Ligand binder design. Structure first.
Ligand SMILES: [Ca+2]
Ligand SMILES: [Ca+2]
Ligand SMILES: [Ca+2]
Ligand SMILES: [Ca+2]
Lengths: 304, 304, 286, 286
């Protein structure tokens, strides 16, 4: 027998008490290449993979529920498929800084774990990694969301086709409970090539021009966004030179003739999840202009 | 000292040995309503939520890595916010069949756990559930992907605005290791209202017409797909009656005047992730036609 | 007891992937596991309605020269419903293996181990424990003639006589058929995106669970609409390895196909005819 | 030792959400936790560069009549970077609470507990342990004047003198500014989707990390382009509760704003001016 109050009180009991930790692990292919005989000149950077949960598929999904993750174990396997008579050499190693962009044989052998071997032999690279707790959501500083990157370079000239596959065996612990939308979980990518407005087409441009191993082998229909604005020289149609400012790109698949592919600029309307295309570039007697400089950061924004 | 073979052998060691089980749990709001005074007539089905990992947000993400899940514990809390002088009553209960569509007070009280209470009191519904292992990927039979659904009905007429919130406290074990794309993890939805071709507009139609509590409170820009084809009567433009066949819809948000909203038919191009709109419906002296019958299953296909 | 245990080793399937064809990802066998596919068990199943899997292993068995230098990934996906052939999906499964084309390997899956039906039905999670997919991981240098063997043991439960056209696995489309992809009388099998359909022999007949609408004309500038439920496979060759499908009428009594009406395209609006996830049972006898 | 421990209880913020305004989801306080926001700690932080959090709890404290019958959800999100105010996001955090508007509650978060900086910097995961968001869960019947209190203890490490305009939390845009949303001289604050900006007082000045391009004309039918880096908040009222922003020039020496050029729209192609994730620091003194 209790009295009738003005208002009863809340009985929302179990709240805010979600599962906290998960250890989780597996083995994931982190890249695959195929090199035709002539290609594979000394030093050709066959692979460069920045490690982030997202790259390890199974992990990538779990990481959308917690805010931190910390690496407990990593190894990579190299496992090219090729017969004994191939006379080329590779060198792999895990660079513990995810920002480091200089890929030389010399800079890998320097890394702990680094391996060197003729194409017909497999190899295991037991690297050195942070084992501290990084973040699952991408951020401004990369040093905090990734433990480093795995690169593999050619060492001689392959006599024949090389079918390399590079597997990463991982185990990791997810620390903090939270809900992270799949847009923010993507890894940022730095260009290593200047985009001139003399090197253009009316509505697109080459992906090899940007000089980035990820953006080169990036998939189709894939909407990106940039930190730096893109300057498009358009016209009213009186011979008039006007100026347009777009922030977003769209990847189109490449060719056997054009290894890397295209990139159509435009507008990524996020409220409605759609992608408009960008205005007709006005070819003109306009002074030469770098529209996007070396080091432009491109972060994937569309639904994954 | 080993000899040089024709081909060395594979050294892909740790493969196919991923993490297998995860227990995981939390508490999630499963719906929220607000009922203005007049609304809330006896029996008004205020809530009807089919339970699936996806509905429990944190869980929904983990479920994309395993193939089965099995429920270890469930309770729901009811927790309306309203002051003591509101004189209306509700009745909640968890229907252990996810297909059961008859929502009567009588059919809830029948369920184990079911509760009855005036709006100003909170309640906990400790239900009966399968505790067997269901599947995370949606399938043809629903009985196998969901343990049932939680419905809440009005019991009198609310004198005042009712702000109910319904929280589900869950704990579940994910059984089987695998990678499931977010398109297949969505829950299917059955319409409970016939769509006549007399009740139409040139390019859209009402969402209340379908008579489905989910499709009514479904979000904006949300592309669906159907099991049954949709028959659109179009024209060549000579007074000609031609026939068109579309499989896909698009949700547009609703009004204070139109509670539920619109639905624009069309084409969901999945290769490229885009949505074209459907042709101008030809209004004509055409015999009355049910385009989509009661019980049409609508499964969400766009990126989540 | 009334239950019958049966065990054996049997070839699930055999592909030849010729020289140079095939590239990372190329699905070289995609086999939905049901007793019909397992030869000796095939006949045992025709007798009872229900089977349950006791043991399952696949032994991969590829045949090529030692210098072949390609590669494959194999594994067993437990969801006969899951329709995702990517490497990533496979590498996620238990059992999964990777090797060079000259190396046999044994995949050791995990499977339902519960009581399933012999004859096909709506929900195919009760007809099958899963499916095995084997993919290319590189480009194969040589002709490889891969023969995937399955060692199996099972328990068969209630005696029955089973119609053999019913025992077969339903095949699902992976790609949409658009109206603007139809030729006058046929279309390319590859459009449907399905390896089992692409490799189904010449003259296979399939029933669809969704209507195939064919716009046609009398030749008066007048567009009319027809409906069809059956396809006939016309074999693929070097020029068109996927082959072709003609729509038409399957007569179930006489077991004969009659080709349907010609497609007439006349300024029609864009249309989806056969959405992805269209189900295609083999109805013709084998 | 050189390190200084300091503890107190302080009001993080105070909102009034008036009668009938506010609906499930409506963010009523979104406060990025940095020492400036915590009053007494505010001054302590101006002296050292580095602080570390020892204890943190927020006590919610809403004030209304007992018959108010709305509701709120509160919680503390550990990622100053994470920009997601939904209930689902909050309910996922540790500490999270729910109550009727007349009930105080105490959120008990989990936080970084590591060594952070006092002055703002590029990566704001080193300036803050996270942010607290409190949302509506129903429609509030009455005026509620919620005052959220924080009991805190901290360790301050290296002595320093700190510029107070630098100590402030950067605010991030949640919505894009489109060119076709500009008025001649201003635009509506609500377009940027940010509660802290929407409630920033009249006359607040903000610097952007991205250029605001303004197309203008001389009045000859000739379109020209200007660039601006500063905004001034013009206070919101009942008709436009979010208020408005004028672009222009902030003079950092004289601490004065000069309004910029008028926007001229003349058959321009669709453009994104300020994409979502544009960063907006408070530069004007307080
Ligand atoms: Ca985060
Ligand atoms: Ca599945
Ligand atoms: Ca049977
Ligand atoms: Ca400082």
């Amino acid at each position: 027998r209790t009295d009738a109050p003005v208002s009863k009180a809340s009985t929302v009991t179990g709240f805010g008490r979600g599962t906290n930790d998960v250890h989780l692990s597996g083995m994931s292919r982190i890249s695959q290449a195929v090199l035709p005989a002539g290609t594979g000149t000394d030093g050709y950077v066959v692979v460069d993979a920045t490690i982030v949960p997202d790259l390890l598929p199974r992990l990538g999904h779990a990481a959308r529920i917690f805010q931190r993750y910390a690496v407990e174990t990593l190894e990579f396997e190299i496992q090219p498929m090729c017969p004994a008579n191939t006379g080329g050499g590779y060198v792999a190693g895990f660079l513990p800084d995810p920002t480091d962009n200089d890929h030389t044989f010399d800079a890998l052998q320097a890394t702990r774990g680094a391996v060197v071997a003729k194409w017909w032999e497999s190899r295991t690279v037991r690297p050195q990694y942070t084992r501290t707790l990084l973040w699952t959501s991408s951020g401004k500083e990369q040093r905090l969301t990734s433990p480093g990157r795995l690169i593999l370079l050619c060492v001689g000239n392959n006599t024949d086709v090389v079918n390399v596959s590079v597997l990463c065996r991982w185990s990791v612990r997810l620390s903090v409970p939270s809900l992270e939308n799949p847009e923010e979980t993507t890894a940022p990518i730095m260009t290593q090539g200047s985009l001139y407005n003399d090197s253009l087409s009316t509505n697109d441009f080459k992906s090899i021009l940007l000089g980035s191993t990820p953006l080169d082998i990036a998939p189709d229909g894939a909407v990106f966004q940039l930190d730096r604005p893109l300057s498009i020289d358009y016209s009213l149609g009186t011979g008039d030179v006007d100026r347009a400012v777009y922030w977003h790109l769209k990847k189109f698949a490449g060719n056997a003739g054009t290894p890397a592919g295209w990139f159509r600029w435009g507008i990524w309307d996020n409220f409605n999840k759609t992608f408009t295309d960008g205005v007709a570039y006005y070819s003109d007697e306009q002074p030469r202009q770098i529209l996007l400089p070396v080091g432009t950061v491109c972060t994937r924004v569309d639904s994954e």
